[PDB]
Each structure stands twice: as C-alpha cells, then as structure tokens.
C-alpha cells in the first residue's frame with residue numbers, strides 16, 4: 434500500500450545500512466566509491482556514491498559508520514553500524530534510562546545509545562554541516578540497522594531544527610526512550626522517521642515496555658518471511674504509539690528475523 | 703532450461719542440504735521431525751520428514767550429515783554437510799588424486815573426499831539399505847552443499863548398481879576427480895546426477911583443472927544473483943565435460959555466490 438517510490442527508498446537505505454557492516458572501507462580515504470561484499474548494496478553501488486568520512490570505534494560508546502555523498506540520488510547519508518556481535522549485544526543489552534532534556538523536555542533515553550551519540554555528536558554534526566554547506570539542495574538522511582538504527586534516531590532527534598530537514602530510516606531498531614521521547618519522535622518537525630520492523634524481530638521489542646520504553650509512531654512492518662523477498666503489499670503502515678499487531682505482538686520473537694530487511698543485513702556473506 | 707517439477711526438486715534438495723548445517727540434529731534421536739533455524743528449510747518442515755540417522759565427525763575424514771525419511775515426497779535422503787569453516791577449507795584444500803578403480807576403471811578421485819567416504823561407506827550403505835528394505839517405493843536421493851556435494855557424488859558413484867536408483871543433487875560442489883571419473887559420472891546408469899552451480903561460485907572451480915581434475919556433464923547453472931530469488935528461467939543446462947560458460951568462465955570468483963543456492967546455504971542466520 435506504500436508507493437513504489439517509498440518502497441524503493443526503504444530498499445535503498447536498507448542497503449546504506451547494510452554497507453555499514455559490509456562496505457569495503459577499512460581505511461577507505463575520502464572520495465572512494467562505496468562498494469560492498471556479497472551483493473549487500475547493489476543500488477548504492479549503481480549510484481555515484483562516495484565516502485565523505487569513515488569512523489570506527491569513535492567516542493566512549495565505540496560508534497562505527499560513515500558519511501556518504503550520493504550525487505545520483507542527491508543525498509548526504511550518515512549510516513551507523515550496529516554491533517559486530519548482535520546475538521551477544523542482544524543478550525547483554527542494559528535497560529537503564531538517563532534524562533535527555535537537551536533533546537526534549539521530560540524525555541529519557543537509553544543511557545548507552547544517548548551517551549554514545551553525545552560522545553561523537555560535535556564531530557559528526559560538523560561533518561554533516563560541511564556537506565550541507567557544499568550541497569545545500571541535497572537531502573540529509575540518517576540511517577542504520579539495529580544499534581545503528583537507535584544511534585541514527587537519537588542523532589536525528591538531536592540535530593534537527595538547524596535549517597536542513599533530517600530524514601531517518603531505521604531497520605530493526607530497539608526502543609530508544611520513554612513515552613515522552615516516543616511522542617517527540619512522532620511529532621518532531623524538520624524531518625520524518627521511517628521506523629521499519631520485520632515479522633517477529635526481537636530487537637524492536639527491546640528494551641521492554643516494562644523497563645519504561647515506548648516506540649514512536651508510525652511503524653512500517655514487513656510481514657514477508659525471513660529470506661523471502663519483500664513486495665510492496667508486504668509492508669503495513671501501523672499508526673499509534675506502542676501500537677500492537679505489527680512487530681509489537683505477543684508471540685515469541687527471533688534473531689534471524691533481525692538479519693533480513695529487504696535482503697541480508699547485520700551479517701556479511 | 704528446466705521443468706517446473708525439476709525446479710521444485712532443486713529447491714527442495716537445496717533445503718535438505720541447508721538442513722545439514724542448520725538442522726536441530728545435535729545428538730537428536732531417530733524419529734525426530736526435521737526442523738531448521740533461520741527459515742533454512744521451510745519446504746522440508748512442511749513435509750512429514752524425520753531423522754532416520756544423524757552422524758557427526760564420522761570416520762577418518764569427520765563426515766557429518768543425516769539420513770531422512772520423507773513420507774510426503776516419498777524420499778529417502780542422505781544429506782552431507784559441507785565444512786563448518788568454508789573460507790578456511792577453500793584456502794587449505796589440497797589437490798592430491800588417488801586410484802579409485804573399485805568405483806570405475808582408470809578413475810582417480812580427490813584423496814580427501816574419497817578417503818572420507820570410504821571410511822563411512824559400510825555404515826551408511828547399511829543405513830540406506832535398511833530404509834530401502836522398509837520403503838521400496840521411495841526415491842533414494844543423496845545431496846549436499848560444498849564438501850557435502852562432493853561426498854554425495856562419490857557416495858552415489860560407489861553405491862549405485864545394487865538394485866535401487868540413487869539420484870544425486872549437489873550444490874556448489876568442487877571437482878571430485880580426473881577426466882575418467884568425470885566421464886563415468888556423465889554416463890553411469892542407476893541414477894541421475896544433478897550438479898548445480900551458481901554464478902561465479904569459487905568452489906566448483908576447485909581443485910583447478912590444471913591439477914588433473916574435470917567436471918561431469920551436465921551442469922545446471924543458476925544465473926540469478928546472490929541474495930536474488932531463483933526463477934525456473936534462471937537455470938541453464940550446460941552440456942559437455944569441462945564446458946565453459948556456466949560456472950566455468952574466465953572471471954573472478956567469490957565466496958558469497960557459494961552461500962546462495964535458492965536461498966541461504968552453508969551458514970545459519
């Protein structure tokens with residue numbers, strides 16, 4: 434029921450997110466073309482997409498990802514990588530909230546996600562803002578899978594309202610904060626959040642509701658199976674804060690579902 | 703190009719081969735229903751399929767796999783796993799040939815694959831023949847991916863001509879021996895060998911021709927990409943021993959192509 438155009442953008446930023454794991458970018462200098470192993474990001478590769486800045490283990494939270502310039506789609510893309518060990522990351526996630534009044538009043542955010550972003554926020558804002566000054570008609574997009582989707586969502590909330598819109602596309606993202614933060618991410622001006630979940634993926638059900646967490650609205654829930662191709666009629670737009678009957682269902686969730694967002698993600702063949 | 707029936711069998715044996723890696727078969731008792739993690743084998747789970755025998759690190763060559771009864775498809779399936787570390791195996795694979803005149807005259811086979819089979823041949827033959835003597839109507843199929851596909855091929859060549867057809871479905875198998883063995887596999891009565899390859903998969907390119915190896919004919923070559931769903935029209939039948947222009951083409955090969963045969967294989971989400 435989503436337009437072909439939105440389905441194509443969902444595909445594209447799933448592959449920018451996938452490229453944060455699989456991108457041939459160990460020491461890739463600025464200006465190198467973005468390429469991946471294992472057909473992880475073919476639509477990225479078709480674009481005129483280059484690395485503006487790569488980072489690995491940055492700040493106190495050891496944040497990894499890259500800033501890209503895409504002259505085909507006219508994008509400035511900040512892509513954050515999830516964990517290198519997702520099963521261990523999932524099973525060892527702490528659920529502590531901290532106040533984040535400097536992002537929204539009465540908002541509380543995951544201590545790790547919000548500390549990791551704060552630690553790199555000055556450096557990454559300046560990189561993004563340099564790119565925007567150079568290409569003021571390009572669209573700014575923040576994206577990521579898993580922990581990277583959390584970091585993208587926190588980053589977006591914090592850097593919006595500085596005269597360029599920031600759209601956020603997250604894939605399998607955990608809850609990032611309390612109901613006031615979910616409410617803020619629902620309504621915040623200056624950019625859209627496209628929060629994409631898949632079947633019974635455990636990560637978007639963590640941290641739990643009973644640790645004081647809430648999801649933002651809306652959710653774009655992929656109903657097609659693990660290792661199954663996604664069609665346009667497989668995505669369901671579900672409205673409402675902590676809406677049930679997309680990913681937030683009372684059934685038993687799984688980790689393989691987290692690794693399949695329009696193709697393989699969070700793991701590299 | 704192939705029939706819809708054969709396309710469905712291709713997909714089904716790809717999942718029996720995947721099950722050798724992702725099956726919940728760890729000291730699993732006989733009679734247990736076959737299930738996989740990570741949606742590896744949904745067609746196998748749909749079927750009334752159970753374990754007749756599991757084996758792990760069997761013989762000198764540490765051969766791993768299972769014998770399955772399938773009362774829906776009327777099958778007896780002997781599925782061999784490939785390596786637990788395929789990249790390590792590819793890198794460390796030696797090319798030594800050894801006399802197999804007891805299989806066919808003037809045939810030479812890979813030392814490791816033939817020795818690994820020979821070590822387990824008596825026990826597994828007994829298992830197969832117990833299933834045949836209980837279900838004489840059922841189709842005997844040997845299958846496997848990677849090293850498992852080579853073991854299924856050698857096992858087939860050895861055990862045919864004892865009163866039951868043995869069909870072999872191999873996925874990304876390496877060459878198994880010399881031109882004589884290749885010709886024997888092309889023409890051997892008592893079953894069909896379906897040797898399936900995918901795009902530029904590295905493993906069917908090993909050992910190299912230059913070490914005295916040939917492929918059997920024909921080859922079913924999948925020309926759809928890594929992480930792309932396979933259509934019936936995406937399989938080409940390629941005739942001739944050491945035919946070029948399926949997998950045997952002069953381009954750079956890669957490992958991810960090995961792990962995508964109708965779906966994920968050789969790794970478990």
Ligand SMILES: *[C@@H]1O[C@H](CO)[C@@H](O)[C@H](O)[C@H]1NC(C)=O
Nearest residue numbers: 465466467478479480481482
């Ligand atoms: C880098 O991508 C650009 C734009 O797509 C292309 O013109 C150039 O050939 C690419 N570089 C290499 C080394 O392929």
Ligand SMILES: *[C@@H]1O[C@H](CO)[C@@H](O)[C@H](O)[C@H]1NC(C)=O
Nearest residue numbers: 734735736747748749750751
């Ligand atoms: C085993 O599979 C059969 C049908 O294929 C079914 O009757 C039975 O419930 C299954 N066993 C379990 C433990 O689910």
Ligand code: NA
Nearest residue numbers: 478479480482
């Ligand atoms: Na490119």
Ligand code: NA
Nearest residue numbers: 621622624625
């Ligand atoms: Na908005």
Ligand code: NA
Nearest residue numbers: 747748749751
């Ligand atoms: Na079953």
